[PDB]
């Protein structure tokens, strides 16, 4: 169920299907994206905005410790490329906390 949620996140991101995230986000999910805080449905709306903008995300690598996952992705928009770290904590099959940080 832990692994399910992480796997669904990757699939959702690859597919550009933000709505699929609703299967792993909860109303109490907290996200920090470069210091900006979002909760619950707002997290889905942020991911939707990212997809709407056509931002291209490629997974580079990932690691896991217990219910904690850390992903390194490359992000491309308008020919500019950046590395981003995405940390998630899963509880009861749901992503409860997420940090997105530009490197």
Query: In this structure, is the dihedral angle defined by the CA atoms of residues 102, 85, 25 and 67, taken in order, positive or negative?
Result: negative
Minimum gap (Å) between residue 34 Cβ and Zn ion: 17
CA dist 53 and 51 (Å) reads 5
Is the Cβ of residue 54 or residue 71 nearer to a second copy in the bound state?
Answer: 71
CA dist 3 and 16 (Å) reads 20
Q: Which of 1, 28, 45, 81 binds Zn ion (CB under 5 A)?
A: 45
Q: Is 15 in the site for Zn ion (CB under 5 A)?
A: yes
Stretch that binds Zn ion, among 40-48, 73-81, 85-93, 95-103 (CB under 5 A): 40-48
CA dist 92 and 2 (Å) reads 7
Which residues of the shown chain bind Zn ion in the complex (CB under 5 A)? 15-17, 19, 41, 45
């Amino acid at each position: 169920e832990e692994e399910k949620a992480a796997r669904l996140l990757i699939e959702a991101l690859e597919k550009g299907d933000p709505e699929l995230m609703r299967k792993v986000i909860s109303p109490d999910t907290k996200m920090s994206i470069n210091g900006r805080l979002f909760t619950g449905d707002e997290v889905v709306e942020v991911v939707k905005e990212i997809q709407k903008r056509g931002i291209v995300i490629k997974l580079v690598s990932y690691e896991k410790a217990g219910n904690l996952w850390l992903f390194l992705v490359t992000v491309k928009n308008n020919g500019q490329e950046e590395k981003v770290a995405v940390a998630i904590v899963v509880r009861n099959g749901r992503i409860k906390e997420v940090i997105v940080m530009s490197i």
